[PDB]
Design a protein around this ligand. Structure first.
Ligand code: CDL
Ligand code: CDL
Ligand code: CDL
Ligand code: CDL
Ligand code: PC1
Ligand code: PC1
Ligand code: LMT
Ligand code: LMT
Ligand code: LMT
Lengths: 110, 145, 82, 54, 59, 74, 110, 97, 149, 31, 59, 32, 87, 51, 103
């Protein structure tokens, strides 16, 4: 089934360029079975999952290797990530402006 | 006037010493490519080391230091538009890391200035009772004879 | 007619206006090479062709950099290895 | 004894060095077409980069 | 011997037929160095000023 | 070879005033930076005025040679 | 040149916010062509006063170089007030962004 | 791979000798990664930074009062006249009038 | 009165081109034999060849490590001696063996001779163009050395 | 403010002009 | 030659350039063995700075 | 209007509007 | 050659010997209306021409300004764009 | 043809050829030894040190 | 063996009545037709674009003060939208700078 699905997809490809088909075939063709699989969910976003019996071969704390689709662009997520990085860095000096072009505008240029 | 000059003698498009000839020469060099901007393959030849470019970058990034982003733009212009897999020599690598270090220090220590990072500003914060003393003499190192 | 102040323009003209035929010929040759490359691509190829690249040596027995293909001695169920 | 340092070198502008900034430069501001391009690509279903695939 | 004992790499001769590219190489050098940048914008303004002065003198 | 000769002459006559304005200016600037007293300054003012007149002379010479080198019969 | 004091007074009135309301009221039933023609006519009247009155009259500032010195002084005043101020700001900007002389630095050696 | 104690650039970082630390960060890293730019930092916005453009700012305007002037002024010849004596131009271009 | 009825602008173009070509033939006929053939055929032809070759083909500056590896050019005329830095124009299909034979004149080359570019040895069954693209991008200076080691 | 000649009407006009300008930019980049 | 047995830091300062060149050659060989290439873009409108300049072809 | 009677010399030089034709001719490189 | 495509001129020396050479008028006047102006003495210009000429008593600094601003805007923001860094 | 160019400035008023500012790391004084004490005279504006 | 060449083969043409100037004077009418037609086409297009826009603007902003208000509001809206896009790109750039600091 995996080979047939891959062959069918690659001639009428997806915007993913059939990546899930490729990895599915690669993991099926292993002798002892797939190490990495795609979790089946009622939740909207699917996740990549790792089998437990091969967890000692991979550098992971858990079996969940994250979502199988990239994040969606969001001002709020960007703000969150930037705040987290600032907190982790803890650098006194961020945002300090020693000289600003004198202007009625708050941010000259930008 | 320009039109009639074209049919007058010694007054064709850019030939002659008339103002019509001067104007046509200006239009000709404009129509040419020599004054166009350079391509991305050729930006790190002159433009990324230019005073206009540096001043504009500093101006439109008010409180920041764009040396590092300029280094990365050079890397881009050489890698992604000229085809060089190894754009940076050892000197350029050192310069990149120097600018990275300066960024780290500027964000770590508030108000750091020239002797430790290349930066000068006037409105500084001083304690209030500023003492002035002579430096100690340079340390006597042992030497033969 | 001429003058010493026009030596720049005289030299530039004398050396460059004879080159314009060659420049146009180069442009025409480039268009014809592009046309032939696109006709070949439409006809079909085993491995792809990069259009705006200087040289395309890739075939069944040759890499896209002129070397022999690795692991190309046998046959594969999914067909070509590329 | 490194933070909040004093001005160690002088600041100056040499005579007749150019500035390349007009009088409306403070009202000028930058812009990138990348956000608009991303929106348009997403809406028209154009070819995505492989960086969307983990 | 090894290739790194060689140093004289900058003696790159070129055919004498290519002397016809003298003016082309000169103009290309001055383009990459002067004309396609801010100094070239100044030079363009200088040419426009020549036109301006010629017109002024005619009038 | 005549083209090379002519361009050499033309560029020299074009840069002559630039030289008189720039490099002798740099020399005067050195002297200004070094001098402190009043007597030497009084005497140096006249050197500066001489440089003014010399610059105008070089400009006249360049004008003459440039109208000679950019004059065409036809 | 003439009426510099009147020009200073004009600038003072222009910067006064009460005069902004007065101009708002005066702009009722008015066209951009009319405004432009009025300003052009004012400038022409000034230059025509000069061209006429210089033939027979001499100001307190008359000198062996005539109005050339007044126009040079206007230029020098403009330069020192506007352009050198901009140069100061640009100097502080460059010194904060790169260091003093940062715009004239040589390219990174390869 | 021959002089390990003398080649420190090709050696592991001191965090690697320490035996203590979804996906985790790698345990082994070299100092030779310092010779790469995008080793640790990401390649985000790599090819899109030379695309942020800003226009020039020069205005080509200058009033032209000719009423002030009553004399002509000199003007340069920019190119040779090829509309006259075209056939002889290579043969007389080297001479000076 | 511009234009005539029944006649086409294309016919007028043909007329004009005929006039120009006839005038060119007349002016070439009534001209000096000493100058016209040169200026009309030999300088244009040489300029065309040079410009086409430069703008189309791709060339390499060749060097040799040792004087003992220099070729024998005593017999062939107009070049009695090898000089390093020679510009050499090649085709895209050229290999290192073909280049070596071209250098050594189809004669017995020395033993264990190899080509390098920026310190990087080329295989002999390699395309010079792609090898340069890989190892020395935009620095095609090749060096011929003896690999005994 | 919706229809009549007034300062709010002019402000609305300018806002609409800005949005139409950006619509034109969207079209330019799309094509 | 730099005596890294007794001055290793001083010698590494001299030799890391050749280490970097080896690091580059490694990738250049891997990409020639495993055929790795990229779609090059069309030629730029101002690839040549001047029309009379020669556009020397590079692999 | 026909191709022939358009490109006839009299109609082309007297009554026709050759502006679009010659503008297309000038901008040919852009279209190509 | 036949002689159909011969040179359409005669050398100045032969014209001078023929008594045919004219030296003057680097410029020309295409139309007879423009040629006979200085000889008419009563209508050098028609009335329509007179009122059309009355529109150009001065140069248009307004048009100069408008065209210069338009050309500067185009030349700066379409033809002379260059990249700038972002931090 | 792969090395970068230094910026060019030349006019009657100012130039960038009478001195060398150096690189970003290895900097140096543009003015020479005799006029370094009088640097204030080669400036339109001067903002002195804090001490 | 005598002269093989005529005089016009050597001597330069007339200085003031030369081949090119006579030629271009002959081609003046056709060039006038061409460029006048092109200029008229461009002018008619620009006028067809400019008339309805000026009408639509003066219909809704008949007075100078209203025109100035509309122009200023247009400027402000343009600047605000540009600021929105710039804020997004600035957030991305801020993240990259923070990752450089983390490195
Ligand atoms: C006598 C001649 C007339 C004199 C008056 C001339 C000046 C008129 C303007 C006066 C009002 C100025 C504003 C003051 C309010 C405070 C703001 C401020 O100060 O900042 C500006 C500036 C400081 O800048 P800053 O510190 O960075 O502050 C923030 C920014 O400025 C502002 O923030 P920003 O950076 O974000 O703004 C950027 C952008 C924002 O603005 C804009 O983008 C647009 C601005 C232009 C508007 C265009 C006009 C609008 C047209 C619309 C209508 C069009 C149609 C109709 C018209 C058609 C045209 C015909 O552009 C600007 O702001 C440019 C500001 C222009 C500054 C003035 C330039 C002139 C300098 C003085 C010239 C002196 C001439 C010689 C005098 C000779 C006398 C002996 O200070 C000055 O400009 C100083 C002005 C001083 C006036 C001096 C008058 C002479 C008096 C004699 C004194 C003798 C001693 C002088 C020494 C030498 C003597 C020999
Ligand atoms: C001896 C040699 C002879 C042979 C010649 C040989 C040469 C031949 C070749 C030609 C030369 C080419 C050389 C290479 C060029 C490259 C160098 C270069 O361009 O940049 C250098 C230089 C370097 O600057 P930068 O630091 O690198 O900054 C560069 C920036 O991009 C640009 O800097 P920026 O943008 O910061 O400066 C612009 C400045 C000036 O901007 C402008 O002026 C724009 C142009 C407008 C001119 C038309 C208006 C005239 C109004 C006159 C009416 C006054 C009242 C009448 C009073 C009469 C009594 C006196 O802005 C301001 O100061 C603030 C003004 C803001 C308002 C202006 C717009 C509104 C206009 C309407 C006024 C309404 C005011 C209402 C106030 C609000 C009330 C509610 O560029 C400049 O400085 C640009 C300004 C230079 C001005 C020079 C001043 C002298 C002008 C006269 C020239 C001679 C005149 C000849 C006779 C004709 C006039 C009678
Ligand atoms: C500081 C100077 C350097 C400036 C900065 C560096 C820039 C260098 C570039 C120089 C370029 C100059 C621009 C030339 C463009 C043409 C300008 C022009 O000729 O008309 C000027 C203009 C006269 O325009 P006008 O069309 O001829 O109309 C004449 C009237 O009808 C009246 O008719 P009138 O017959 O009754 O009087 C005619 C005229 C007669 O003017 C004269 O004949 C000169 C007066 C006495 C002979 C010796 C003069 C020099 C030494 C004493 C004066 C010291 C001030 C220097 C004034 C420079 C001009 C000489 O009277 C004046 O204009 C008064 C000028 C003296 C103002 C004194 C203010 C005292 C406060 C300053 C503290 C004391 C000085 C501190 C040390 C500064 C040392 C640099 O004078 C004005 O500034 C108008 C004043 C309006 C009252 C404003 C509110 C009071 C503020 C007073 C300050 C005024 C601004 C100037 C600042 C100077 C004091 C800091
Ligand atoms: C960045 C520059 C970009 C281009 C490169 C530059 C190349 C040109 C260089 C020119 C240099 C000349 C020097 C400046 C001239 C000054 C004096 C002057 O112009 O007298 C006033 C004069 C006013 O004329 P007027 O005698 O009062 O006549 C008024 C009549 O009442 C009006 O009524 P009308 O019956 O005459 O017709 C109404 C209307 C329209 O005409 C009609 O009757 C209706 C027909 C119009 C429809 C077609 C429109 C035309 C074609 C389309 C144009 C636009 C877009 C093209 C798009 C393409 C297709 C989509 O008239 C016009 O549109 C005038 C045509 C403007 C053309 C420019 C004048 C010809 C000069 C020759 C230039 C050489 C170029 C070569 C030509 C190309 C190769 C063959 O000014 C102008 O009109 C010309 C504008 C000058 C252009 C600006 C360039 C800047 C100059 C910089 C000088 C400053 C130097 C230092 C800079 C640093 C400062 C700090
Ligand atoms: C494309 C960019 C051009 C920009 C630069 C050029 C300026 C722009 C203006 C257009 C240039 C062309 C102006 C032509 C003016 C001549 C009009 C004329 O009537 O001439 C007399 C000719 C000859 O007429 P005739 O002799 O047969 O009959 C009429 C006789 N009289 C004149 C006595 C009444 O008229 C024509 O038949 C039409 C010629 C014009 C059309 C050709 C345009 C020439 C431009 C291309 C050059 C190359 C020609 C070969 C093309 C091959 C095509 C495959
Ligand atoms: C932005 C661009 C601006 C610049 C404009 C660019 C375009 C225009 C540039 C032109 C400038 C240079 C023009 C110079 C032309 C020089 C060519 C020349 O005159 O040749 C020298 C010869 C030399 O003649 P000559 O030696 O007897 O006399 C020459 C001058 N004196 C006397 C001083 C020595 O000139 C000719 O007579 C021939 C010229 C006409 C032929 C042109 C070549 C084409 C030939 C085709 C027909 C071939 C027939 C073959 C049949 C064989 C059987 C018989
Ligand atoms: C208000 C509307 C008035 C009508 C105006 C319409 C004018 C349209 C003409 C656009 C032609 C501009 O032509 C274009 O200019 C830009 C410079 O800005 C050049 O841009 C070039 O350099 C820049 C900066 O390095 C890079 O984006 C890139 O390398 C390259 O595109 C293009 O190579 C050129 O093709
Ligand atoms: C008789 C044939 C046609 C005669 C007309 C000749 C005029 C051609 C000049 C146009 C300018 C060409 O300049 C440049 O050359 C070729 C296309 O030609 C293109 O070059 C690019 O695409 C072509 C495809 O054809 C590739 O072969 C080439 O490897 C690539 O670099 C560039 O995108 C173009 O900018
Ligand atoms: C509200 C109305 C909006 C109207 C919108 C009008 C849309 C106009 C879009 C034109 C964009 C064309 O964009 C420009 O075109 C040329 C070819 O034509 C491209 O091609 C050019 O540059 C690239 C390389 O730099 C190569 O293809 C080639 O060298 C050259 O032909 C440019 O890469 C592209 O920058």
């Amino acid at each position: 089934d995996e080979g047939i699905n891959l062959m069918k997809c690659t001639k009428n490809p997806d915007p993913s360029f059939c990546a899930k088909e490729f990895v599915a075939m690669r993991e099926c063709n292993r002798p002892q079975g797939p190490h990495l699989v795609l979790s089946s969910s009622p939740s909207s976003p699917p996740h990549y999952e790792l089998r437990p019996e091969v967890k000692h071969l991979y550098n992971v704390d858990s079996t969940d290797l994250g979502s199988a689709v990239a994040p969606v662009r969001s001002k709020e997520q960007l703000d969150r990530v930037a705040d987290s990085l600032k907190a982790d860095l803890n650098l006194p000096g961020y945002g300090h402006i020693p000289y600003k072009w004198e202007s009625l505008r708050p941010n000259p240029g930008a | 006037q320009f039109w009639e000059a074209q049919f007058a003698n010694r007054s064709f498009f850019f030939f002659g010493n008339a103002w019509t000839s001067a104007a046509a020469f200006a239009f000709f060099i404009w129509w040419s490519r020599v004054f166009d901007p350079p391509p991305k393959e050729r930006l790190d030849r002159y433009w990324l080391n230019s005073p206009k470019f540096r001043i504009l970058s500093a101006f439109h990034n008010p409180g920041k230091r764009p040396g590092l982003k300029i280094s990365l733009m050079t890397y881009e212009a050489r890698y992604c538009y000229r085809g060089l897999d190894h754009p940076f020599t050892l000197n350029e690598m050192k310069d990149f890391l120097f600018k990275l270090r300066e960024q780290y220090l500027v964000n770590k220590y508030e108000g750091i200035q020239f002797p430790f990072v290349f930066r000068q500003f006037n409105r500084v914060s001083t304690p209030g009772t500023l003492e002035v003393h002579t430096s100690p003499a340079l340390q006597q190192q042992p030497h033969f004879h | 007619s001429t003058s010493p102040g026009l030596a720049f323009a005289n030299l530039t003209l004398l050396l460059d206006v004879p080159q314009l035929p060659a420049i146009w010929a180069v442009n025409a040759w480039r268009e014809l090479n592009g046309l032939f490359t696109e006709m070949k691509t439409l006809a079909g190829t085993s491995d792809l062709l990069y259009p705006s690249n200087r040289y395309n040596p890739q075939n069944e027995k040759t890499n896209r950099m002129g070397r022999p293909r690795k692991y190309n001695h046998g046959e594969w169920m999914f067909g070509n290895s590329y | 004894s490194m933070d909040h340092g004093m001005q160690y070198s002088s600041i100056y502008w040499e005579t007749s060095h150019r500035t390349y900034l007009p009088f409306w430069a403070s009202l000028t501001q930058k812009f990138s077409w990348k956000i608009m391009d991303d929106q348009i690509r997403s809406f028209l279903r154009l070819p995505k980069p492989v960086t969307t695939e983990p | 011997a090894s290739p790194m004992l060689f140093t004289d790499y900058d003696n790159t001769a070129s055919p004498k037929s290519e002397l016809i590219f003298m003016a082309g190489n000169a103009l290309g050098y001055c383009t990459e160095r002067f004309f396609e940048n801010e100094y070239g914008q100044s030079i363009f303004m200088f040419a426009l000023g020549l036109a301006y002065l010629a017109m002024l003198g005619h009038e | 070879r005549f083209y090379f000769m002519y361009m050499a002459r033309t560029t020299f006559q074009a840069v002559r005033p630039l030289l008189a304005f720039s490099v002798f200016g740099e020399v005067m600037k050195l002297v200004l930076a070094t001098m402190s007293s009043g007597l030497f300054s009084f005497l140096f003012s006249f050197v500066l005025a001489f440089e003014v007149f010399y610059f105008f002379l070089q400009c006249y010479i360049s004008y003459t040679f440039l109208t000679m080198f950019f004059t065409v019969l036809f | 040149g003439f009426h510099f004091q009147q020009y200073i007074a004009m600038a003072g009135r222009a910067i006064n916010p009460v005069q902004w309301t007065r101009a708002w009221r005066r702009m009722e039933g008015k066209s951009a062509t009319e405004v432009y023609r009025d300003a052009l006519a004012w400038t022409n009247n000034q230059f025509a006063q000069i061209s006429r009155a210089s033939q027979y009259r001499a100001w307190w500032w008359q000198n062996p170089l005539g109005m050339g010195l007044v126009l040079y002084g206007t230029y020098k005043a403009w330069h020192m007030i506007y352009m050198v101020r901009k140069q100061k700001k640009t100097a502080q900007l460059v010194a904060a962004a790169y260091g003093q002389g940062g715009q004239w630095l040589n390219p990174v050696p390869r | 791979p021959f002089m390990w104690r003398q080649r420190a650039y090709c050696a592991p970082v001191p965090s690697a000798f320490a035996s203590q630390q979804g996906v985790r960060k790698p345990l082994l890293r070299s100092n030779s990664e310092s010779l790469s730019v995008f080793s640790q930092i990401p390649d985000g916005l790599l090819g899109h930074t030379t695309s942020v453009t800003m226009g020039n700012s020069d205005i080509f305007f200058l009033p032209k009062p000719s009423n002030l002037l009553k004399i002509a002024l000199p003007a340069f010849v920019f190119m040779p006249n090829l509309t006259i004596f075209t056939r002889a131009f290579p043969f007389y271009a080297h001479t000076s009038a | 009165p511009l234009g005539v009825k029944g006649r086409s602008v294309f016919a007028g173009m043909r007329s004009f081109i005929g006039q120009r070509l006839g005038r060119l033939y007349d002016s070439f006929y009534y001209s000096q034999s000493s100058t016209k053939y040169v200026m009309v055929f030999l300088f244009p032809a040489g300029i065309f060849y040079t410009r086409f070759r430069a703008d189309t083909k791709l060339g390499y500056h060749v060097f040799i490590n040792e004087e003992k590896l220099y070729p024998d050019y005593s017999q062939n005329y107009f070049d009695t001696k090898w000089t390093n830095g020679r510009k050499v124009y090649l085709d895209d299909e050229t290999t290192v063996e073909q280049l070596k034979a071209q250098i050594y004149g189809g004669k017995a080359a020395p033993e264990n001779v190899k080509v390098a570019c920026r310190g990087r040895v080329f295989e002999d069954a390699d395309n010079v163009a792609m090898a340069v693209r890989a190892f020395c991008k935009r620095d095609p200076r090749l060096l011929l050395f003896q690999d005994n080691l | 403010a919706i229809k009549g000649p007034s300062v709010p009407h002019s402000i609305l006009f300018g806002v609409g002009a800005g949005c139409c300008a950006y619509a034109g930019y969207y079209l330019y980049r799309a094509m | 030659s730099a005596q890294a047995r007794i001055d290793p830091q001083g010698a590494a300062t001299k030799c890391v350039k050749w280490f970097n060149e080896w690091r580059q050659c490694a990738w250049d060989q891997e990409k020639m063995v495993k055929g790795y290439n990229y779609i090059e873009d069309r030629r730029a409108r101002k690839h040549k700075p001047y029309i009379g300049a020669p556009d020397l072809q590079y692999s | 209007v026909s191709f022939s009677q358009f490109f006839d010399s009299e109609y082309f030089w007297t009554k026709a509007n050759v502006g679009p034709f010659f503008l297309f001719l000038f901008t040919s490189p852009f279209w190509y | 050659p036949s002689g159909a495509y011969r040179l359409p001129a005669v050398d100045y020396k032969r014209q001078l010997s023929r008594g045919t050479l004219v030296e003057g008028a680097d410029f020309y006047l295409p139309t007879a209306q423009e040629q006979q102006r200085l000889a008419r003495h009563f209508e050098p210009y028609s009335e329509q021409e007179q009122e059309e000429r009355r529109k150009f008593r001065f140069q248009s600094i307004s048009v100069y300004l408008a065209v210069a601003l338009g050309a500067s805007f185009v030349h700066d923001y379409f033809y002379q764009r260059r990249p700038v860094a972002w931090c | 043809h792969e090395q970068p160019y230094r910026a060019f400035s030349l006019g009657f008023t100012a130039n960038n050829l009478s001195g060398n500012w150096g690189d970003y790391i290895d900097r140096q004084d543009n003015k020479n030894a005799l006029m370094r004490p009088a640097r204030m005279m080669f400036t339109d504006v001067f903002i002195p040190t804090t001490k | 063996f005598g002269p093989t060449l005529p005089d016009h083969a050597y001597y330069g043409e007339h200085a003031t009545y030369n081949y090119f100037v006579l030629f271009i004077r002959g081609m003046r009418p056709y060039l006038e037709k061409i460029f006048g037609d092109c200029a008229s086409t461009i002018k008619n297009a620009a006028v067809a674009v400019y008339r309805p826009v000026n009408a639509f603007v003066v219909k809704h902003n008949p007075d100078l003060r209203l025109q100035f208000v509309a122009f200023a509001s247009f400027i402000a809206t343009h600047m605000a939208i540009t600021k929105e896009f710039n804020d997004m790109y600035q957030r991305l750039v801020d993240i990259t700078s923070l990752l450089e600091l983390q490195a």
